Enzyme design. Structure first.
Site, PDB file in Angstrom:
ATOM      1  N   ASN A  28       0.630  -1.063   0.112  1.00 43.49           N
ATOM      2  CA  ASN A  28       0.148  -0.161   0.264  1.00 43.49           C
ATOM      3  C   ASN A  28       0.628   1.437   0.394  1.00 43.49           C
ATOM      4  OD1 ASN A  28      -2.397  -1.861   1.694  1.00 43.49           O
ATOM      5  ND2 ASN A  28      -2.186  -1.190  -0.019  1.00 43.49           N
ATOM      6  N   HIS A  59       3.279   1.998   2.352  1.00 41.19           N
ATOM      7  CA  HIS A  59       3.595   2.632   3.869  1.00 41.19           C
ATOM      8  C   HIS A  59       5.014   2.104   3.546  1.00 41.19           C
ATOM      9  CE1 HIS A  59       0.027   5.025   4.462  1.00 41.19           C
ATOM     10  NE2 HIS A  59      -0.512   3.634   3.291  1.00 41.19           N
ATOM     11  N   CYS A  95       6.333   7.617   9.162  1.00 44.15           N
ATOM     12  CA  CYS A  95       7.838   7.904   7.969  1.00 44.15           C
ATOM     13  C   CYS A  95       6.785   7.813   6.562  1.00 44.15           C
ATOM     14  CB  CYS A  95       8.688   6.848   8.142  1.00 44.15           C
ATOM     15  SG  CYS A  95      10.359   7.803   7.033  1.00 44.15           S
TER      16      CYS A  95
END
Ligand SMILES: Cc1ncsc1C(=O)N1CCNC(=O)C1
Ligand SMILES: Cc1ncsc1C(=O)N1CCNC(=O)C1
EC number: 3.1.2.14
Lengths: 269, 268
Positions: free
Chosen positions: A190, A192, A227
């Site tokens: 995804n 991330h 992050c």
């Protein structure tokens, strides 16, 4: 991999790969953490969760909610060597409205002995606003379907390391590794940053001499903020202690916004 | 995994993992490259090579020699999806005194169709001086015991992509990603940067819009010099065109070349 007989936990065996091991020819803690995440994902698919990388329930999809990690705690007694078969058992548990927990037990497939254990806390987040929230009644009822109803904990003890409060490292740090950036292999399906990457970045500020002479026994990591793909991170470490203990802090290289804090315990080889 | 009936090649099945896939929910080219490396190590162990991460023969150990990668070429037709089983067959071949070659065929375990192929060139290097060497008579004799004696190539065609000369990118590069550094997860069991990391660093300078709209079909990478644990790398890319790119990895400071390569991408 497969669910156990009662359908309340899941087991999977892994053969440790050549690129998955460190200098001691045994699995790194990042390989352990990737395997915990893989068996967790296979368990979720087997009990009817979303097959899109988010592992959501029907009520969660209707409310635009996702699970986000709050804490990861791993304790390893023996790291499996290259070519060994490790068996991992995993299960989930609901913690009222707070969130949920995923627990794991690692075993040497040949001897049947427990070589490690892990626990992780997950909190509900609205996917759109990114605001944390409590677990609703309908979501708590869906967890009853596939979770043991009597408490089953990987870390049962009265005063266990998995639930200790972690302080914020004060400048100046004793050690630091600056300018850490994620590359595409650090992202999940995804886009991330993978939770395991934060573990690697924490460990980057441990001096090489500690890694060469000690084995990592326990790591507790708190996840405060994500992050992003274009963010730059600073990893800081200070000794707090035959056993070595460290306090850790990951923060954005620019403004110093905290993303993670943690602790590690190392024993002499 | 296991050697085939004739003992001249090796096969292994892998179930694609959740963290091994990209946005398309299919294996990244770095996952493919890690699986090629894993089946290669399992094949070497089964035919009696050293179990220390170097995969050396008995005469290589007496002469203090190790195999180093000179080139990696991978062509993928279909990337396996998350949860699919991919079967990989691998074998080695001796190329006289030049060096050796490891080849691979990737198949969809269910349909039996070829979904990809790869080839890699390896050259002899003295472990102490770091000087490249030719393959001696005694090590060519040891390769005869586990390699097919009639030529078996993953890319048989005359004048194929796997054997093309790659030019050096000229400044200014069209795209760049600077300040790339390896972390401990990028090192192998002997503390050298894993060959697959260089592939990821090459791809870092490809614009995200290309990755989002195209599939990587071919990558050819030349290995010139090793990046050390404390080195910093700059990844450069220029379009040469289907989309085609020319790539260069060089040290951030003095600009010493470590790798050069090319990629071919097809519109999704
Ligand atoms: C079922 C479940 N309940 C709490 S965590 C969790 C889970 O299996 N995952 C793994 C995949 N992605 C996630 O975000 C959470
Ligand atoms: C047997 C062989 N011959 C040429 S390459 C190769 C090989 O299996 N590897 C994989 C492990 N480490 C190496 O250095 C090369």
């Amino acid at each position: 991999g497969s669910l156990t007989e009662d359908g309340l936990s899941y087991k999977e065996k892994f053969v440790v790969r050549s690129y998955e091991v460190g200098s001691n020819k045994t699995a790194t803690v990042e390989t352990i953490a990737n395997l915990l995440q893989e068996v967790g994902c296979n368990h979720a698919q087997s009990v009817g969760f979303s097959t899109d990388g988010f592992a959501t329930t029907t009520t969660m999809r209707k409310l635009h909610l996702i699970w986000v990690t709050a804490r990861m705690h791993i304790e390893i007694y023996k790291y499996p060597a290259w070519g060994d078969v490790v068996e991992i058992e995993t299960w989930c548990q609901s913690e009222g409205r707070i969130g949920t927990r995923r627990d794991w037990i690692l075993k040497d497939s040949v001897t049947g002995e427990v070589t490690g254990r892990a626990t992780s806390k997950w909190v509900m987040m609205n996917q759109d606003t990114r605001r944390l929230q409590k677990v609703s009644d309908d979501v708590r009822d869906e967890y009853l379907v596939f979770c043991p109803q009597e408490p089953r904990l990987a870390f049962p003890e009265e005063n266990n390391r998995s639930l200790k409060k972690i302080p914020k490292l004060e400048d100046p740090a004793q050690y630091s590794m600056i300018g850490l950036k994620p590359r595409r292999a650090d992202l999940d399906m995804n886009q991330h940053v993978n939770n395991v990457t934060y573990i690697g970045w924490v460990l980057e500020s441990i001096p090489q001499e500690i890694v060469d002479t000690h084995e990592l026994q326990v790591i507790t990591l708190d996840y405060r903020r994500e992050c992003q793909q274009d963010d730059v991170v600073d990893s800081l470490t200070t000794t707090t202690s035959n056993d070595s203990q460290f306090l850790h802090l990951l923060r954005l290289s620019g403004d110093g916004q905290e993303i993670n804090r943690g602790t590690t315990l190392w024993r002499k080889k």
